[PDB]
Amino acid sequence: WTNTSGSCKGRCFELQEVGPPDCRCDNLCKSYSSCCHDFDELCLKTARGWECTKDRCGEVRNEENACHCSEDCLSRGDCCTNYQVVCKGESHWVDDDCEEIRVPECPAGFVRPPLIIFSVDGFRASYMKKGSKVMPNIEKLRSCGTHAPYMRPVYPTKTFPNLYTLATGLYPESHGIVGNSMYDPVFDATFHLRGREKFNHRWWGGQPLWITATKQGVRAGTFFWSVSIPHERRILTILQWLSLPDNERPSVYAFYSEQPDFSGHKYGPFGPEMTNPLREIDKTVGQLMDGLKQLKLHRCVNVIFVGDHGMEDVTCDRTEFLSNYLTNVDDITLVPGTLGRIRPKIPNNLKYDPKAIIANLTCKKPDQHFKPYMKQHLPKRLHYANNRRIEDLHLLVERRWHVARKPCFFQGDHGFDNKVNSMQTVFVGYGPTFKYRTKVPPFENIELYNVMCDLLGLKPAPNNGTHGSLNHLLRTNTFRPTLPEEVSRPNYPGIMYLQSDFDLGCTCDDLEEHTKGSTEERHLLYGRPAVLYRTSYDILYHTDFESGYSEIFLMPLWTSYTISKQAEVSSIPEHLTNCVRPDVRVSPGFSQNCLAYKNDKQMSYGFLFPPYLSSSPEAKYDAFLVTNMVPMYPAFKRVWTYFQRVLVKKYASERNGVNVISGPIFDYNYNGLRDIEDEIKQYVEGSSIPVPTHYYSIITSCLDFTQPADKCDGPLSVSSFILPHRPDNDESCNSSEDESKWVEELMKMHTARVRDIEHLTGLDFYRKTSRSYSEILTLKTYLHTYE
Ligand SMILES: *[C@@H]1O[C@H](CO)[C@@H](O[C@@H]2O[C@H](CO)[C@@H](O[C@@H]3O[C@H](CO[C@H]4O[C@H](CO)[C@@H](O)[C@H](O[C@H]5O[C@H](CO)[C@@H](O)[C@H](O)[C@@H]5O[C@H]5O[C@H](CO)[C@@H](O)[C@H](O)[C@@H]5O)[C@@H]4O)[C@@H](O)[C@H](O)[C@@H]3O)[C@H](O)[C@H]2NC(C)=O)[C@H](O)[C@H]1NC(C)=O
Ligand SMILES: O=C1N=C(N2CCN(Cc3ccc(B(O)O)cc3)CC2)S/C1=C\c1ccc(Cl)c(Cl)c1
Ligand SMILES: *[C@@H]1O[C@H](CO)[C@@H](O[C@@H]2O[C@H](CO)[C@@H](O)[C@H](O)[C@H]2NC(C)=O)[C@H](O)[C@H]1NC(C)=O
Ligand SMILES: *[C@@H]1O[C@H](CO)[C@@H](O[C@@H]2O[C@H](CO)[C@@H](O)[C@H](O)[C@H]2NC(C)=O)[C@H](O)[C@H]1NC(C)=O
Ligand SMILES: [Ca+2]
Ligand SMILES: [K+]
Ligand code: NA
Ligand SMILES: [Zn+2]
Ligand SMILES: [Zn+2]
């Protein structure tokens, strides 16, 4: 209980940790009905508005006023933000020219540049194009500071998951806020936008920036503001806190606005009604920068201007209804709209039939505007499966559409797949620690927590950013990364066996009379991947490829090869169709066997280096080695053969050659991390040959396309995929057609970062290059989006 009778005199917005039964005066008290009775009279002054006027200049200080224009206000720290402009012939910050900030210019008593995070909700990246005509203060920050053309949010692209990802560096499946609404089957409790449950700390995982700061002795201003505190008051409060005594002043601050999200929902992102809220946000940035200038802090503080997600055109007329597909929608609960999550209405209802539901939702209308997925089948790049709050059945919804259970005040919405263009949002950093007038490539919001820790001198808690990948945003305070240590060194087996030693069931129609040589220099362009876990594997060399063959998983961990721009594609000769060859370098006991494949009526096999790309008819025989074989369902072979036979050469032709590394991934427990042996759950029939859940490929070339991939001087260009290894093509509605009509569409959906592959394989790539380690970390976080 809270003793309301207390008072907020000289307590306004205090940074005091104060609770039961004492009444509060802090920026969150209203949200807890815990404010002293006079909080609103003393702390939320509104009198005479937010701007000094010429008449008020040198007034007698009335403490009833929202802000002051009296002679004393400046050292007191509570001037209106335009005080000096109106009353002292100063210029607005926006009217001053940009000048480089080479070191911080902070008042005596400041030991580090403060960080202010200015977050804006639903700020679509493309709004920045409106430029200084609409948002001159923001445009100054953008042009003079360090800006990305956009920042990628996390999925789902809604507020709670994204704000908490920004604060923690974690994917939602890890921090726990997997939605704006969620059901937790263990709590048997429901988190809603509206209401009290969300205040319970049990929902919120990981460690947010303000906690990391506090635990390391850095004072944070309170990040959250009760919704009733107006933006102008939030700015005045931040400015007041910055004027505190050296022993009280915080080092990190956050401002938040619900705009332009609110207006985007009402009017849509391209509505003329959007100009006004963008102007209002810019005005707020203006007040902040004018205020900082009056305090002599505009060349001292680092400012981050960042959004949570964008906004798409979505209206009532574009709604799919589950009742058009399913007979009894009254028995399910749907988290609806721009994504779908389905569970039974009655928790654990034994009559719930998810396989039947998914069957009725799969490719049932030719224009269908969503696609069902069991969560383990969602693109791995979404990282959206490893949490009990994520329903098994998910609907990925097409941009511009809604999905609803059964049968207009809105024109915009968000929540869609985070690679969708309209979902991208904004990042600008301005201040002494950021670079001056620098554009940087788009990057993901999970990376910002490490950077904010760097800006504040903090050691980040374990998170999903790749620390160092954003060093190029910073003038100083960079993080020096260190290459992870190789755990398992390879073996280099020679010939140790005779064809006679092998009883595998393999046959091939293949003068009786494979050294390293230049294999590595040609086919392994960036060094051998390091194996970061304890295991046993062999380097195997060939004319056309090299591989790291695992003696434990009975297949290559990786297979590396380079295809020139001019390379020749050739067939598999009829007499070699079923050819599999024993590999005399590897024990028969560490080899697969063709009999398992014969016996398994559902499982077939494929190859990592494709016979289609062999350099000569004799080199082609290497491609049929048992050590180049992997288990593949026929459905998957449709994709894989098309990739191997058509696409790789297409990429080589377009990129002036390519280097490919391909391989298996085991993620049976869908946690985005390499499985240990115990976690593998499927084997080829009658064998101990494990079945990959996915196959990856990493395709690298020279960023300067005028240079061949094998003679590249400078930066690299990479695209990668993590393809789901599935027994059917139900995901691809057009799969009955020729592969030229559907395979590339599937691959684009399952694009991936090299970093994603590293997590899933326990491998570390690009260890031997001419680039810096920070540059390589940037490369490994790149996602080719195809938008
Ligand atoms: C993205 O980055 C994160 C952070 O590094 C990685 O997540 C970590 O994965 C490791 C390895 O699997 C886990 O280690 C296990 O730790 C547990 C003990 O964990 C408890 O203590 C830690 C430390 O305080 C705490 O962080 C954990 O928090 C989890 O559980 C809370 C209560 O249920 C929950 O509120 C919180 O949101 C978080 O849940 C998430 O993780 C759990 C697994 O622990 C998972 O079931 C759940 O669905 C969420 O995903 C927890 O209280 C030991 O017993 C084990 O032996 C093992 O050491 C870390 O716990 C985990 N950290 C976090 C914060 O999730 C991700 O792998 C990485 N993703 C990718 C793709 O690289
Ligand atoms: O002061 C704040 N108020 C917050 N709110 C309350 C209002 N609530 C309304 C709401 C709900 C959903 C959505 B979305 O899906 O577009 C937008 C607004 C949003 C969160 S968030 C917050 C500040 C804050 C600033 C920086 C960070 Cl990193 C964080 Cl985690 C929170
Ligand atoms: C809640 O707050 C009120 C108001 O401050 C408290 O009233 C004070 O109590 C003390 C001790 O009994 C009196 O001597 C003062 O005269 C009161 N102060 C004022 C300014 O009214 C009250 O005690 C608190 N109630 C609790 C803690 O349950
Ligand atoms: C899947 O869709 C089919 C319709 O295609 C549903 O089957 C109909 O529903 C009722 C009850 O089963 C029957 O009386 C009708 O004869 C069925 N129509 C047809 C054309 O078969 C089925 O119920 C749906 N399944 C789910 C789980 O929603
Ligand atoms: Ca796993
Ligand atoms: K078979
Ligand atoms: Na299909
Ligand atoms: Zn939002
Ligand atoms: Zn919204």
What CATH code is carried by the domain that includes residue 306?
Answer: 3.40.720.10
Residue ranges making up the domain that contains 39: 1-44
Query: Any idea which residue has 């209980």 for tokens?
Result: 1
Do 380 and 518 lie in one domain? The reply is: no
Sign of the torsion formed by the C-alpha atoms of 354, 359, 363 and 365: negative
Q: Residues 657, 701: contact at Cβ < 8 Å?
A: yes
Distance 505 CA to ligand 6 centre (A): 13
CA dist 294 and 82 (Å) reads: 9
CA nearest to 418, candidates 576, 308, 548: 308
Residues in binding site:
121, 159, 180, 261, 265, 308-309, 414, 667, 669, 671, 673, 675
Q: Residues 615, 529: contact at Cβ < 8 Å?
A: no
Q: Which atom of ligand 2 is nearest to the CA of 167?
A: 28
Distance 379 CA to ligand 8 centre (A): 23
Q: Residues 537, 486: contact at Cβ < 8 Å?
A: no
Q: Ligand 1: does its nearest atom lie under 6 Å from the Cβ of 386?
A: yes
Going through 623-754 in order, the beta strands assigned E by DSSP cover 629-632, 658-665, 694-702, 716-724, 751-752
Q: Residues 537, 627: contact at Cβ < 8 Å?
A: no
Does the active-site annotation cover 159?
A: yes
Distance 727 CA to ligand 3 centre (A): 73
Do 285 and 415 lie in one domain? The reply is: yes
CA dist 421 and 150 (Å) reads: 9
What interhelical angle do 231-242 and 275-294 show, nearest 10?
A: 20
Q: Beta partners for 395?
A: 340, 372
Provide the number of structural domains found in the chain. 4
Do 202 and 346 lie in one domain? The reply is: yes
Exposed, middle or buried: residue 238 (CB in 10 Å: 0-12, 13-18, 19+)? buried
φ, ψ for residue 650 (rounded to 5)? -60, -45
- What does the block give as tokens for 270? 């391209």
Do 352 and 484 lie in one domain? The reply is: no
Exposed, middle or buried: residue 409 (CB in 10 Å: 0-12, 13-18, 19+)? exposed
Cα 536-611-623 angle, rounded to 5 deg: 35
| 413 membership: H or E segment, kind and range | strand 412-413
Instruction: State which of 2, 4, 5, 8 you would mutate to test the pocket of ligand 3, scoring each by most atoms of that ligand within 8 A of its C-beta.
Output: 5
As for ligand 4, residues whose beta carbon falls within 6 Å of it are 326-327, 353, 356-357, 360
Do 347 and 452 lie in one domain? The reply is: yes
> 195: helix, coil or strand?
coil
CA dist 591 and 568 (Å) reads: 30
CA nearest to 581, candidates 623, 615, 611: 623
φ, ψ for residue 29 (rounded to 5)? -65, -40
Distance 174 CA to ligand 1 centre (A): 6
Chain center to CA of 645: 32
CA nearest to 529, candidates 559, 562, 565: 559
Boundary-marking domain end, from 57, 75, 90: 90
Boundary-marking domain end, from 417, 452, 479: 479
Q: Ligand 2: does its nearest atom lie under 6 Å from the Cβ of 256?
A: yes
CA dist 460 and 582 (Å) reads: 50
Q: Ligand 1: does its nearest atom lie under 6 Å from the Cβ of 463?
A: yes
Q: Which atom of ligand 2 is nearest to the CA of 224?
A: 1
Q: Beta partners for 121?
A: 260
CA dist 750 and 173 (Å) reads: 19
Do 80 and 198 lie in one domain? The reply is: no
Q: What is the CATH number of the domain that holds 699?
A: 3.40.570.10
Do 315 and 343 lie in one domain? The reply is: yes
φ, ψ for residue 148 (rounded to 5)? -100, 150
Do 82 and 117 lie in one domain? The reply is: no
Going through 111-209 in order, the beta strands assigned E by DSSP cover 115-121, 146-147, 151-152, 182-184, 189-191
- 373 CB-side CA count, 13 A: 23
What interhelical angle do 448-456 and 159-168 show, nearest 10?
A: 40
Do 110 and 178 lie in one domain? The reply is: yes
Do 273 and 371 lie in one domain? The reply is: yes
Going through 82-165 in order, the beta strands assigned E by DSSP cover 115-121, 146-147, 151-152
CA dist 663 and 673 (Å) reads: 15
CA nearest to 514, candidates 606, 581, 567, 565: 581
CA dist 39 and 4 (Å) reads: 10
- Which member of 159, 425, 769, 778 is catalytic? 159
HEC sequence for 528-588: CCEECCCCCEEEEECCCCEEEEECCCCEEEEEEEEECCCCCCCCCCHHHCCCCECCCCCCH
Computed on alpha carbons and rounded to an integer, the radius of gyration of the chain in Å comes to 30
| 420 membership: H or E segment, kind and range | none
End-to-end CA distance of the chain: 53
Do 53 and 34 lie in one domain? The reply is: no
Query: Any idea which residue has 């030991």 for tokens?
Result: 111
Q: Provide CB contacts within 8 A for 167, sequence distance 6+.
A: 208, 209, 210, 223, 449
Beta strand pairing status for 530-531 and 763-764?
antiparallel
- 70 CB-side CA count, 13 A: 16
Do 304 and 400 lie in one domain? The reply is: yes
CA nearest to 11, candidates 204, 297, 237: 237
CA nearest to 488, candidates 549, 397, 427, 559: 549
As for ligand 3, residues whose beta carbon falls within 6 Å of it are 3, 5-6, 21
| 140 membership: H or E segment, kind and range | helix 136-144
Q: Ligand 2: does its nearest atom lie under 6 Å from the Cβ of 223?
A: yes
Cis preceding-peptide flag for 715 (omega within 30 of 0): no
CA dist 193 and 531 (Å) reads: 44
Q: How many helices (H) and strands (E) does the chain have?
A: 20, 29
Taking every pair of Cα atoms in the chain, the longest distance, rounded to a whole number of angstroms, is 106
CB atoms < 10 A from the CB of 153, how many? 27
